[PDB]
Amino acid sequence: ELHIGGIFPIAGKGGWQGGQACMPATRLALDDVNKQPNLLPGFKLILHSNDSECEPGLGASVMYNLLYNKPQKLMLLAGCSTVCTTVAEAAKMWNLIVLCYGASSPALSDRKRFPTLFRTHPSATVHNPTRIKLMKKFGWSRVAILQQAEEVFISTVEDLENRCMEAGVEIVTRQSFLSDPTDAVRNLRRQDARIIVGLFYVVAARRVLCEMYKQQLYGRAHVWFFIGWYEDNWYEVNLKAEGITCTVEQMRIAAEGHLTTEALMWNQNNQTTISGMTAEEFRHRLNQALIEEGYDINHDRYPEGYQEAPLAYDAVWSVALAFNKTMERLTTGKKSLRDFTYTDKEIADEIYAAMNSTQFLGVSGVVAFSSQGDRIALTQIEQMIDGKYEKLGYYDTQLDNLSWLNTEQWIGGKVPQDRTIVTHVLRTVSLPLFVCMCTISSCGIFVAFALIIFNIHRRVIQSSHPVCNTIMLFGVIICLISVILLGIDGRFVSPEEYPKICQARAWLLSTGFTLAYGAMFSKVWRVHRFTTKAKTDPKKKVEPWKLYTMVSGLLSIDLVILLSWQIFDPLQRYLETFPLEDPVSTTDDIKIRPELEHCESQRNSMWLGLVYGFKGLILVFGLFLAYETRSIKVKQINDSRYVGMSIYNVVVLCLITAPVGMVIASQQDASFAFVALAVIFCCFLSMLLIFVPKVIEVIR
Amino acid sequence: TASIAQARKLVEQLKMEANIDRIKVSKAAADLMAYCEAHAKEDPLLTPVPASENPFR
Amino acid sequence: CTLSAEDKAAVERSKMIDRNLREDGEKAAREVKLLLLGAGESGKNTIVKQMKIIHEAGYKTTGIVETHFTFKDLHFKMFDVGAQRSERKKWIHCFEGVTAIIFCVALSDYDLVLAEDEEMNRMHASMKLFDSICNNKWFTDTSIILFLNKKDLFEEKIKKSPLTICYPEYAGSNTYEEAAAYIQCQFEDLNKRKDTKEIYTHFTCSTDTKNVQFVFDAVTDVIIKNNLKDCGLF
Amino acid sequence: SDVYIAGFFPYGDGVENSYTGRGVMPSVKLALGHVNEHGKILANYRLHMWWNDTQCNAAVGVKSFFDMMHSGPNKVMLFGAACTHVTDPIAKASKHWHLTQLSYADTHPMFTKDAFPNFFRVVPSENAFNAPRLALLKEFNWTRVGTVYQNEPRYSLPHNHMVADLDAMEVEVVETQSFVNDVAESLKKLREKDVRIILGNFNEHFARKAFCEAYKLDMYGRAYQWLIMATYSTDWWNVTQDSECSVEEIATALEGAILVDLLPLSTSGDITVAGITADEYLVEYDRLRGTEYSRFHGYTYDGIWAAALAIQYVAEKREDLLTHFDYRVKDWESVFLEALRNTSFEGVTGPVRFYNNERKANILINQFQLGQMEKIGEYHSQKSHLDLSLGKPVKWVGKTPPKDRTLIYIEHSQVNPTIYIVSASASVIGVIIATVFLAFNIKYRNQRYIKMSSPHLNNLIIVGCMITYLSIIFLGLDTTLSSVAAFPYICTARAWILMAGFSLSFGAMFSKTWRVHSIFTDLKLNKKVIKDYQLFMVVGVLLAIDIAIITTWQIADPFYRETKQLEPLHHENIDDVLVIPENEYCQSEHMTIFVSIIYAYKGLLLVFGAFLAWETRHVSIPALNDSKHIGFSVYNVFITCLAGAAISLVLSDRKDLVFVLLSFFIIFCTTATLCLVFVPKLVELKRNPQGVVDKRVRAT
Amino acid sequence: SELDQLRQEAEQLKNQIRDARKACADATLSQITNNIDPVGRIQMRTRRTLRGHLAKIYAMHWGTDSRLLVSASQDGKLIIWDSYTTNKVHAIPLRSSWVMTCAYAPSGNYVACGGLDNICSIYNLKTREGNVRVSRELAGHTGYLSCCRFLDDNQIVTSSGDTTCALWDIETGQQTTTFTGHTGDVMSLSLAPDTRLFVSGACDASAKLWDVREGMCRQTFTGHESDINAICFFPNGNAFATGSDDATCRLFDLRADQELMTYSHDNIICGITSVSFSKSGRLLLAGYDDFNCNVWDALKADRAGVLAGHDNRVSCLGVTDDGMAVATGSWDSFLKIWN
């Protein structure tokens, strides 16, 4: 009678003790197979099972006992991935076929190391696309990895890093440990890791949770990805918290909001399987069966291995099918399955051929083995809140379809960030001070317009040259407009508008200064030329073709310089960096990076220096001329004393301002206040000196 | 003749002055010394006086 | 302390009387006091009538009559000893402390002999009186302002007679500028106290406000100079 | 008797790691012969090895172990295979046969005592290389280190142990980096953190790759020191066709690196348990090996001797001979465990004593000196003694070991002392001009025009201007010549000097104008005009309130000196030695309040003086008409102090053009005031007619 | 003829009276009392400092109450003081500030004054209404007013600057008696302790003995080297002091009709301005232009002591009815009380 060997991790200690739920499934499958008369004609399937406790050494001892006993086993069934690795590697020497119902190790796909190995269980790489999709959905790019030093987790991590590199996610830290995660968790905290993927077994998961609590590696900043096939109750702590120094409450608060991913492994349909039973018909079974074994299925959804329970059923059914599908006795009557020996590689080859070509619909879905293989299963995403697991959605890797149920319960309602990022904050002038400057500037513009209307007949003010005063008023009004465009800055404009307003500044301020100081310089120079230079010889007053010449030439030179330097080098905006500062709100884990907008270019500094030098030259020349025409008085240009004081004040203010502005440009508020106040005081004082005596003389 | 009348008036005044029965200066000096000696005690400025009876203290 | 209530009442009465008297003396000091005089009303030229003529300072013949008016927020008190005779030292010594003394000299009298006595001429009498009234121990710091009255008649008369009738020592040419300079030199050479005492020759011409305006200028100058000397700047 | 011990060696020709077994077999034969011929050790028993070649194959090793346990001469101990993937299944299975195992060439840091209770290692694991590197860090005074390790458990578990050791020993770890194949990015991240001493855990291939990237990133010389654990093959750096850079490049980058490896044979000359020394054993091994060599020969010799000692201990403890051995009885396992935990003897590799199933062995230290690997010294693990006086002396690039960190230096600022000397010359010239004016107004003090100007108050003005000009000397006085404690004294001296100069000059001028106003506004003949000593007392009272407010500020808010802390630290060098400049600017918590108060009352004085000037702006006396000079001086001073407060209150890293600006401010103010008040007083008597005779006065 | 005869008669009368005066001077004044010892030095402490005047004081009169003194100056204030408590009683404004004479009625009800306006004005002080008022105005002689004294109420003898003393009836506002004959300008007047005789100097270095009822000078006293400034009287009525610019006090006698003694010092060159006697007549208070006043013993013709405290000319002097205290009026706008 067809007899096979089995290895089931039931007892405990460590690893994945899925035997407690996969052994009753194996018994049910064997009962179903032996009750079918047409499946194995005149044959029954007998399983010589044993307990390995996920220990590779105990698995090797069990395999030795199975392979050195009287009945020659046709094939072997193994559970835990760690036991599966050793058993499948060693079984190549006995020509034994090994079927691993619960081994997820990606390293078991190597056909060179494990030639005679088959797996109903999907590879652990199934969770990797789900994890990467989860990272992409929430905008995560810097993820750490904490893994246990095992081949299954090492292979899963290798595949995950390969897919992350192919996707664009950077691996920050790769901590690994054997049994104690204290140093690894400490290094996780040291490297400032926010998103951490955890690949452990249940006991190592509990120790990692204890390290989480004892090192505060949780809360509103750390998101932990766990494995989904832990027990629902025991994922935080339910079984053996005696070794852990923490208490169930500490584990529950520490395990809050961590995401788990897992394959479904149950037939998510209604069609009958090969055994003529639905998935729910096998769920009603194996629930009563586990009830008779003491497990409280009333509240806890069965022990570990319940999620993988259909895999053992499908594995036994596939074993029966492959034993039936051989039919090589018909081709050669001498050879039969009953006469299989560990030396015979022919019957082993036929068994492998039958196993590879099997394909049916089981309780776990479609069982195709190495024939199709991939058939990436639908994965389930869940999150632990208040000590309970709430499903968040499903992801189908083959169809790239993520059916999301919005139930995530992030701390504070905001998704945690993968890092602490700096925020570019623009610094601008204070609004009250801007309004204070703007009101005075508007008053100056109104006064200039009113005096312009006043001047433009009566010989009291027509005795003096009125056209120079009107041009001066034009220039000063333009200068207050310049102050306005200087103050409005980048707070009221977009980044693409700053070059335009900056060019408008550099043009219109220069033209206003040129107009005003040209009027003043022309007046004093005309006074000098018509009284002092003409000396005793007179009979000739002042008139056009002399006064307009200097001011028009200066304005034309200023305009030409402006146009040449603007065309040759336009104005761009540069952002001056300021140092990192903690934000006022500590809840947001983002740094502040203040900055101040400025204007400059490659040739902007040299052209600015040249225009400043020209302005200084004309200022000094005008001041010297005003000093030289101190006592000189003209009947026609009687306004020479006031113009002299205005010129002296203008030169002094410009020379005191431009160095100071170049120094304090870093402080936007102080620089704007100084420039605006200097221009306002100069402008208003010039208006008063030139025009107020004229108005009071007209009135009186 | 205003000058003659003034001279006559001055001469008459001088004659009237000469009509005074002038006495010896010895008697006048004796009267002065007798008055000064008799009134020496009743002179507040001469005799030192206590502050209590002095109005100014 | 030990003073009784009636002592406090007497103290308060003394304090209020003293405060009133101090206030009265304070407002009485700002009124300038002058003293016009000359050679016996010969050089008067109705100078006192100029204020009545302008009338800007609007509202017995025994001893001295006082002229009271105000000019540019400045009260003017002006005293004249009209035909006082008597003895000069009797009342001159009480007129010290005046802001200035107005000495008026009649320029029309350059060719007219004094009516009081034909032996000596009028300008000589004015000269000796100026010597007597400028060099007193009282008027040692009092500034003097000089009025040249009726100078139009002097100008209209100099072209008909030489100046040697009373100034033989001057050989200069007969000219208005030369005659005026010689007269000023003769009058100012009598100032033996020129170090600390200042002299002004603000003349008078017709019924114009210029005379009183320059009189105000002169008294302002005198006050300012006195204050400057008081504070140590002169 | 015929005691047998099972052995596993990769002896097969052409198999991976065949050189190890082929080179250690002669040592096994020598040790077995020595034990058999030894009368004292195993007198009544003859030791044999029943060894099977494993071909570095897990399946073959497992099959050989199963065959050994099934039938044969009843082996009593196992000699663990060199290959890790062969030792792991055998070591895990051997516990359930109640057998103890001895290693001879396996150093993987995963055969811990917790997971492998029966596994005794005669060769130390890779965690043994952590202590010598810590001792090297302590010897050369290294405290700042960085780590780069391969993402393999063999190189990541000892890395975690070493990081924990460094944390417990108080050595700062800058940044630990892992790699799978990209060493270049890990080295770049190490460089970006300014790491000088680098600890490396990687295999020979990645060692060559890492040094290639070190050359490509310039990680050699006297600035970087490499401390790597190197159990690599002989002349590993002299191997081509495996690195991008040439052999010469590798030898260039590898120069000076200290490499830690296991010492094959003890060099202490002690007599071992065999009766010979390590030198005689080496002679015999060289004669008997032929052409096969392995670095573990002494360790296998010691393992054979330890197995013989344990067998003798077991035979002496229990009277029953080993012919009654049984795999199913835990008593045999307990007795053998006690025997191997009581093992203590001297072997050719040193003293053998199992502490936590592992022994402490001498560790050989090497360095790359002049293109060759020369031994520096040797670390004795049993005594924790780092003895560097054995091999060639350690050779650095210069004469000292490379230093960690950057060795920053907080340097002061000279602030262009040439500018300081120029400002001192300008202040000296100003003082000379003030002295000339003092002489001019003192000699001619009895002249009418000079006397009318109150020459004593003019002398006060001159003294104030002299003090203000002297203020520049203390303004730019660098803290280098003032030490540290005198900085607040210097700040107070400068503040009071400026305040006193301003007070003297402007109080004297305003007192002059106040007296002129009192003279010219009341018009009283006999008036109590304020005298000179009263004005002196008023100016003294003004300077007294100045000293009073500065005293109150000093007894209330001392000067808490601060620094700019310019981070740039100027240019750097190859060794990254930089000097950080720290400009000094004394500050107080109440500086703003004091500055506001002083500016407020000085501005009140300024408007009072301007009011006095506007009152006595019409004085006809030329010497008593100081209105214009007061106006000009007040305007200049006010604008200058506003600009100076603006410059100083936002003091920045410039501190050089700032000093020039303040010096120009003070010089311009003082000189402008002096040449405004005395120049008319000098051109009116020394150029215009000397002796005030009132030539233009109509009254005079 | 008539002029020559009148001059000869006047010269003969002058020679006759000079011979009679020489014969009358039988015994020298300094020799009669040469055996009488002096009374030593008397200390005159400034008991009360009276301030409040704001001009030079030109007049001062005591009162029969010995506490009410009237001070006159050019600031335009006749102030009645009180030596007991330094308390002013009634400051009297004037229509004319140029005043130099002040007088006190013996009853204390009235107060007189006069100056350069040739008006002698009397003010009623004690009345039902508190405020003082001009009781009467007596604008009289053309010359400037130099002195005035009231024998009782409604009657006051007054001097003039036209060399004509007069007696004034206040109620009728007319002069009932004239006094003409003064060669020089009248300066100071004093009255005998009766209603029969009053003394009067003039600007001719002489003194005269007028009679109020008759109006003819009974005796003329000469011998001064300069015009008179201040004259006094003996307590009983037989002698009277007389001081002028010659820095010499010339005592005279009514019956002897000749000068008795001379009060002068070598280093004193300051003219006298105020002379008053004492109760016993032994002392003689005199004030000069030295800014100091000194007391002369009327018997030994020697100075008794010095007195200073004024910064200008001492132009006023007075002695109370009982003689407890003496006061001065200087040109420095201050008043002082001694003893």
Automatic annotation (TrEMBL), chain A:
First-listed, main subcellular location of the protein, grouped into a coarse class: membrane
Keywords: Coiled coil, G-protein coupled receptor, Glycoprotein, Membrane, Receptor, Signal, Transducer, Transmembrane, Transmembrane helix
GO terms of molecular function: G protein-coupled GABA receptor activity
Gene Ontology CC: membrane
Highest taxon, organism lineage: Eukaryota
G-protein coupled receptors family 3 profile domain segment(s): 440-700
A biological-process GO annotation: G protein-coupled receptor signaling pathway
Membrane topology term: Multi-pass membrane protein
Subcellular location: Membrane
The keyword Coiled coil is annotated on this UniProt entry: yes
Keyword Membrane: yes
Chain ranges passing through the membrane: 431-456, 466-486, 506-526, 547-568, 606-627, 647-666, 672-692
Protein name: Metabotropic GABA-B receptor subtype 1
Automatic annotation (TrEMBL), chain D:
Chief location: membrane
Key words, A-Z: Cell membrane, Coiled coil, Disulfide bond, G-protein coupled receptor, Glycoprotein, Membrane, Phosphoprotein, Postsynaptic cell membrane, Receptor, Signal, Synapse, Transducer, Transmembrane, Transmembrane helix
Entry keyword annotation includes DNA-binding: no
Subcellular location: Postsynaptic cell membrane
Membrane topology reported for the UniProt record: Multi-pass membrane protein
Ranges for domain G-protein coupled receptors family 3 profile: 426-700
Transmembrane segment boundaries: 419-440, 460-490, 535-556, 593-614, 634-651, 657-679
Gene Ontology molecular function: G protein-coupled GABA receptor activity
Domain of life: Eukaryota
Family the entry assigns: Belongs to the G-protein coupled receptor 3 family. GABA-B receptor subfamily.
Protein name per Swiss-Prot or TrEMBL: Gamma-aminobutyric acid type B receptor subunit 2
Species assigned in the record: Drosophila melanogaster (Fruit fly)
Span of the entire protein shown here: 29 to 728 of 1220
